[PDB]
Amino acid sequence: NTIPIGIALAQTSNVALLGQEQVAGAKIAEKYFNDKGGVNGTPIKLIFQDTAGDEAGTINAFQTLINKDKVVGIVGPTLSQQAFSANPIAERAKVPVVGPSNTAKGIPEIGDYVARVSAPVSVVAPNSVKAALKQNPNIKKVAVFFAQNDAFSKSETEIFQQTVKDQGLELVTVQKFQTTDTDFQSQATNAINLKPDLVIISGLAADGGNLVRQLRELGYQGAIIGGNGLNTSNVFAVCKALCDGVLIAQAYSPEYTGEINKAFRQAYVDQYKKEPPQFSAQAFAAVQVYVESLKALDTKNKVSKIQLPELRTELNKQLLTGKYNTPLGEISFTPIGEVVQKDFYVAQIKMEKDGSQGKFTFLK
Ligand SMILES: CC[C@H](C)C(=O)C(=O)O
Ligand SMILES: [Mg+2]
């Protein structure tokens, strides 16, 4: 007998360029927590249902997890674009959802059953602009690009644009693209003709990486910031050596000295031979929230004796009150499910000259 927790992430489609890291983090959490006895001796069982890359797939995944798999709660989905469409299904059904990577404005406000462990664009993104200005105090002109079909990208670009304004910089253009585009020659050239000193990109991984590469090919030599959708080594394959120097804000640091991070990092590094990415740590934290909440609930109200609808409602109520020492640091929730998290960072892509290997270097 086990306690089923649903994992609804993009395991297929180009969105899996981000989802792959989350699956890895979730599996690490499953072993970590089950090795400690699961929920007071009862193991958890992660049940994975692929959302693919769109809203319909996420709705189907959620409905399958809720109705067929009988899960006590869901971790997911990968994208805010998917969450805005699918989370209301879980809200209506009174099934908790914890978002591992949904950073758009308005996610926790979807309802009383929606929380997130992923710090939002408003708190994460401005730091990368400040980092760019530290490395080059003479930045004056900024070109901004965003994916106009993606909810997160639209939310993120608004924060980047406001930050540019607040730092006293000139916004020379805002260019739009679609996440499904591969060619950005017209937008890139339009921007390059305005002689920007800094370029900011809000997109996802494949699109973001292709845009970075094309900007460099077209002769752009200035600074580049990528938003959260570019925050994966899976962009290295796409831009290769031309990824070098891209700044991306982080809501996680491998070097964070919390005991559970040391354990998580060690487990990740031993397996994957590189530092754990943000998305992996955030997915781990989402699973942790469920395990620790299930433990606290079970101690007060033995879960094996609670029928599923009440179990879900009590689990939701419990998780919102909890304090968690996670790889992300000490986190908690506001009464509407917003994450409370103190520390943020900025990392910079460092490519080896041959372009076949790279890493994220954290700025001090
Ligand atoms: C995977 C992270 C994703 C791009 C995000 O931040 C969001 O959709 O809100
Ligand atoms: Mg909420």
CB 261 within 8 A of CB 325: no
Of 162, 36, 34, 19, nearest to 79 by C-alpha is 19
Q: What is the chain's alpha carbon radius of gyration, rounded to the nearest angstrom?
A: 20
- Copy the structure tokens of residue 259: 């005991």
Please enumerate, by residue number, every residue annotated as part of a binding site for pyruvate. Answer: 80, 103, 228
Find the 160 Cα to ligand 2 centroid distance in Å. 25
Task: Assign residue 135 the CATH number of its domain.
Answer: 3.40.50.2300
Rounded CA-CA distance 277/75 in Å is: 18
- Copy the structure tokens of residue 165: 């304004």
70 & 191 share domain: no
Q: Which atom of ligand 1 is nearest to the CA of 101?
A: 2
Residue 337, C-beta contacts closer than 8 angstroms, at least 6 positions apart: 108, 112, 114, 115, 116, 320
130 & 224 share domain: yes
Resolution of this model in Å is 1.5
CB 103 within 8 A of CB 344: no
127 CB-side CA count, 13 A: 20
Longest dimension (CA), the chain: 67
Q: Please list the helix, strand and coil fractions of the chain in percent, rounded to the nearest 5, in that order.
A: 45, 20, 35
Residue 113, C-beta contacts closer than 8 angstroms, at least 6 positions apart: 90, 91, 94, 95, 96, 97, 316
- Copy the structure tokens of residue 54: 């769109």
Look up the domain containing 232 and give its range.
121-253+343-364
198 & 287 share domain: no
213 & 353 share domain: yes
Q: CB count, 10 Å around CB of 153?
A: 31
111 & 160 share domain: no
Beta strand spans in 100-158 (E):
114-116, 141-147
- Copy the structure tokens of residue 55: 């809203």
Ligand nearest to the CA of 111: 2
At residue 91, what are phi and psi to the nearest 5 degrees?
A: -60, -50
161 & 264 share domain: no
Of 38, 257, 230, nearest to 124 by C-alpha is 230
Task: Tell which one of 21, 79, 116, 122 to mutate to probe ligand 1, the residue whose CB is within 8 A of the most ligand atoms.
Answer: 79
101 & 16 share domain: yes
- Copy the structure tokens of residue 319: 């998780």
Instruction: Give the total number of structural domains in the chain.
Output: 2
101 & 22 share domain: yes
Residue 232, C-beta contacts closer than 8 angstroms, at least 6 positions apart: 17, 18, 21, 205, 277, 279
* 18 DSSP assignment: H
